[PDB]
Design a protein around this ligand. Structure first.
Ligand SMILES: CN(C)c1ccc(C(=O)NCCCCCCC(=O)NO)cc1
Ligand SMILES: CN(C)c1ccc(C(=O)NCCCCCCC(=O)NO)cc1
Ligand SMILES: [K+]
Ligand SMILES: [K+]
Ligand SMILES: [K+]
Ligand code: NA
Ligand code: NA
Ligand SMILES: [Zn+2]
Ligand SMILES: [Zn+2]
Lengths: 341, 341
């Protein structure tokens, strides 16, 4: 399958991340894309191409315009306000607060943020756009007829909601990809999030959209980031009622249990009538990944790819999370091998 | 007038605070209490007594029980979780999120927080209780017959809402004082927040209570912390409709304009029928205060105190904000001089 990758991902190179009450070098670093890229190439998937230029038409259909406008000038405004560090939100519009939008940079950054550990830095906008382009090109290959494609997105995006960034996500690549497929002719598309974390941003985007189905397997939000979304009770709302299926799971969850969830989600995706499936691929479910509590092994990733590919519809794999462990690329490549069959 | 002060305020001595994208030394440092205390004594207010031990009965009437329970052991759980820094929240329950409460410390700290710049450190809980005690004792003096009293509270409290901490506040001292006056015999009490910042936590607590009136003068939330509450349109809800009066003002606001809002707030308090007024005093409205954009002078604090005392009802002054400048104590003493007459 073709691999879409942009070098401009390196423009996203934040210096800080709030973790454990300290500012440390971000875990979502440029080297992640490098090792994943090297591994997939070694696995044989060497047909790597750079993404083409794309406007904001597609993304404007899933993200709020105010939010996108905010991301584009966030850094300049922050720097212009005279702050020394990177752009990090501290005030948030939580329970029983006003719905009004602040006018200054200090207020807006919190208004448009769901997780403060994520800092905005120089190049973030440009990088997010290149990652969005990689997703769009991936979707076009699918529309063109390809059975599968791999968009090596970075930064990731399943935590970026309609009008907020967080979890190292600014633009929901998977959402944009899904939207692109619909613009190319599809009437029904599904997004399958296998990343350890709940794709709260993807769910938020399509919660009231009846033309897109969203299924996610993840650590129980009661004890895992993003903490405030991902519960089984959330099945959709209004025009999108019934199009969300969450599968929260506890600590030590082996592939034996994780696999049942995967099977059930594919069954719901089939009953929905998806013409294609966008897979938000995160390999942080790996037993050796320190940021998760699931127990998946390297071989299980081959099984994952095969199971999803057996849906019988075209697949677009979009890179999401995964700690920078020596086996990150290996696991990603294992998923592509499973898909290739 | 008697001054209620606790030495245990020093138990709250956080090492870090998130500002401008960096972790800098907290602005709400112990020296503020020292400087203020020395100044009031210097001004003749040398009758300083420590607060007696009090239970949680009063505070449990304005704050959520789960919230208080969370505070008592927040630090322990944080450290026990293996983190190196201070307890700082990163994930927040913002727009379109689940109302469920996470079970782990990582998720609960965000659930119970509205501002990430405030870190929970060793002794924060104990310090907050001592500060609450000072407010309660100050309230007892007023209930006994004193025409005025001053609770040198630290940490401050007007940003602490029903079930959330932030803005360097954990327990809402003013709210607790007002509740105490009600339990002593008052049927109606008013809280006047003259601190530069909107008392969002105090407003949140009494928004639906018809027995307490809340008036606040502050920097427009459109461009000032807490950013998400404090708009003139917020006048109350349900059982408490009509009991909130916000007076947001712009940059460069001098006493010429500020005093006009004060007069009106007092007029509404009188119409409400308050039997006493709890004054949330913050001297961060001073022209040389770095965190605010108002321009009050040291002498204006004497006028302010006099105008408030002219209400004709007992007054309990509770310390809130005001940072940096050594004139912090001078300004607080001036307010007390105006009140004392
Ligand atoms: C052991 N170790 C080094 C870590 C453990 C947990 C976190 C974390 O929860 N971080 C919160 C930020 C959310 C992460 C989102 C990235 C992702 O995988 N999305 O799907 C970080 C580091
Ligand atoms: C120039 N300088 C040193 C500063 C300027 C602004 C802030 C701030 O907005 N901080 C946000 C945290 C809220 C502060 C609440 C304290 C208060 O006065 N409450 O009423 C901080 C420092
Ligand atoms: K997921
Ligand atoms: K793991
Ligand atoms: K105020
Ligand atoms: Na949907
Ligand atoms: Na009220
Ligand atoms: Zn993840
Ligand atoms: Zn203040």
């Amino acid at each position: 399958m073709r691999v879409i990758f942009s070098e401009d991902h390196k423009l996203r190179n934040a210096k800080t991340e709030l973790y454990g009450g300290e500012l440390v070098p971000p875990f979502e670093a440029p080297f992640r894309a490098e090792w994943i890229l090297a591994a997939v190439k070694e696995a044989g998937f060497d047909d790597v191409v750079a993404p083409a230029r794309h406007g904001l038409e597609t993304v404007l259909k899933v993200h709020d315009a105010g939010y996108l406008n905010f991301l584009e000038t966030a850094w300049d405004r922050w720097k212009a306000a005279g702050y020394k560090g990177e752009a990090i939100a501290t005030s948030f519009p939580v329970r029983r607060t006003s719905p009004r939008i602040p006018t200054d940079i200090e207020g807006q950054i919190g208004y448009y943020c769901n997780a403060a550990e994520t800092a905005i830095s120089p190049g973030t906008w440009e990088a997010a756009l290149s990652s969005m382009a990689s997703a769009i090109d991936g979707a076009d290959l699918i529309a063109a007829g390809h059975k599968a494609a791999f968009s090596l997105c970075r930064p990731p995006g399943h935590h970026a909601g309609i009008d907020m960034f967080g979890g190292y996500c600014f633009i929901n690549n998977a959402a944009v990809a899904a939207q692109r497929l619909l613009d190319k002719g599809a009437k029904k598309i599904a997004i399958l999030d296998v990343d350890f974390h709940h794709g709260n941003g993807t769910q938020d985007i399509f919660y009231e959209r009846g033309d897109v189905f969203f299924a996610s397997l993840h650590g129980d939000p009661a004890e895992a980031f993003p903490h405030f979304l991902g519960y089984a009770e959330e099945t959709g709302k209004g025009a999108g009622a019934g199009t969300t299926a969450n599968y929260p799971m506890g600590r030590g969850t082996p592939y034996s249990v994780w696999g049942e969830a995967l099977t059930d989600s594919l069954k719901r995706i089939a009953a929905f009538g998806a013409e294609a499936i966008v897979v938000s691929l995160g390999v942080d479910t790996f037993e050796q990944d320190p940021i998760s509590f699931f127990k998946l092994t390297s071989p299980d990733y081959i099984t994952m790819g095969r199971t999803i590919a057996a849906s019988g519809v075209p697949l677009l794999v979009v890179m999401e999370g995964g700690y920078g462990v020596p086996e990150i690329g290996l696991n990603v490549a294992n998923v592509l091998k499973g898909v290739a069959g």
